[PDB]
């Protein structure tokens, strides 16, 4: 059904972990995801359980404070995230709103995780992303949002791919 996003393909790896286990690791209050957000220096991390009243999907929300490295404005920011899980393995859509940064009103980002089982203890992981503009900033500003966002997005997910790798 649902395809990739018209932005970039961040992750496309095959792991020798079950789709169930891999799903448990990424989309729950797992010690993996805990030890990982700690590793990328995220503070004030707060998770919610998945909703239940819905029939075809579920929803949760996350929040956490992140460090900003790009010499532009604050040296930290808050991030409210919303995840919707569709069981099929599974797929989950993520809306990430970063607050407290420059030009926060201009844009937000979307990400899609695809988990497809392959064998008893083997599954694939795909992650595509895209940038979504509520309003169009002029050339100078937009180039900067594209540049800094994709650098922080790739740096995040590439490290996420490596940590799942060393997890066995
Ligand atoms: C702070 C930067 C860029 C700031 C741009 C500017 C122009 C204010 O310097 C923002 C833009 C997009 C943000 C990421 C969106 C996707 C997620 C995935 C989630 O699991 C964890 C947070 C993360 C990595 C955001 C980090 C901050 C980002 C890079």
Swiss-Prot record:
Modified residues (Phosphoserine): 54
Domain VASt: residue ranges: 6-168
Tissue: Highly expressed in the brain.
Localisation: Endoplasmic reticulum membrane; Cell membrane; Cytoplasmic vesicle, Autophagosome
Function per UniProt: Cholesterol transporter that mediates non-vesicular transport of cholesterol from the plasma membrane (PM) to the endoplasmic reticulum (ER). Contains unique domains for binding cholesterol and the PM, thereby serving as a molecular bridge for the transfer of cholesterol from the PM to the ER. Plays a crucial role in cholesterol homeostasis and has the unique ability to localize to the PM based on the level of membrane cholesterol.
Domain remark in the UniProt entry: GRAM domain binds phosphatidylserine in the PM and mediates protein recruitment to endoplasmic reticulum-plasma membrane contact sites (EPCS) in response to excess cholesterol in the PM.
Protein name, entry field: Protein Aster-A
Originating gene: Gramd1a
Segment of the intact protein contained: 364 to 536 of 722
């Amino acid at each position: 059904l649902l395809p990739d996003l018209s932005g970039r393909l961040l992750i496309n790896s095959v792991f020798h972990m079950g789709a169930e286990r891999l799903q448990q690791m990424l989309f729950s209050d797992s010690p993996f995801l805990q030890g990982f957000l700690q590793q990328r220096k995220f503070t004030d991390v707060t998770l919610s359980p998945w909703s239940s009243d819905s029939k075809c999907h579920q929803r949760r929300v996350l929040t956490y404070t992140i460090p900003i490295s790009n010499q532009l404005g604050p040296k930290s920011a808050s991030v409210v995230e919303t995840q919707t899980l569709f069981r099929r393995g599974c797929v989950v859509d993520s809306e990430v709103l970063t607050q407290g940064i420059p030009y926060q009103d201009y844009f937000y980002t979307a990400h899609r995780y695809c988990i497809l089982g392959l064998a008893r203890n083997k599954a694939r992981l795909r992650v595509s992303s895209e940038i979504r503009y509520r309003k169009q900033p002029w050339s100078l500003v937009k180039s900067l949002i594209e540049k800094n966002s994709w650098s922080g997005i790739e740096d995040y997910f590439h490290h996420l791919d490596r940590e799942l790798a060393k997890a066995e």
